[PDB]
Design a protein around this ligand. Structure first.
Ligand SMILES: [Cl-]
Ligand code: NA
Length: 129
């Protein structure tokens, strides 16, 4: 599923991400835009052999099992394919574990390089939330 901007904002809000660990909703929408272009089916392979999955491009080296990342952890205890669903619940629940992990949203490279320090409230402007 390719979400609309306000559609995704409202789904993330319903799942408890607004101000989760201090990060306003606009941060999460901005990260999803630049990680996946709002597409739940996005995948991208990394040089180390790991793969990033779904709307928030969660990585198989630490967070999910894809059966082909040797010596990886599965800290969200899920198959990586579950992150590609049109229902974002699994992605959100795993993202909450990541952002609690220590370096916050800096774990998402696109957030650090394209969202951090910008006017992220613009990503929810106009939405009925
Ligand atoms: Cl933080
Ligand atoms: Na893994």
């Amino acid at each position: 599923k390719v979400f609309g901007r306000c559609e995704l904002a409202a789904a993330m809000k319903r799942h408890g991400l607004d101000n989760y660990r201090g990060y306003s909703l606009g941060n999460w929408v901005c990260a999803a835009k630049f990680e996946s272009n709002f597409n739940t089916q996005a995948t991208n392979r990394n040089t180390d052999g790991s793969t990033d999955y779904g709307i928030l491009q969660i990585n198989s080296r630490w967070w999910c099992n894809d059966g082909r990342t040797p010596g990886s952890r599965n800290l969200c205890n899920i198959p990586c394919s579950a992150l590609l669903s049109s229902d974002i619940t699994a992605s959100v629940n795993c993202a909450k574990k990541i952002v609690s992990d220590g370096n916050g949203m800096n774990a998402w490279v696109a957030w650090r390089n394209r969202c951090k320090g910008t006017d992220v409230q613009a990503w929810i402007r106009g939405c009925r939330l």
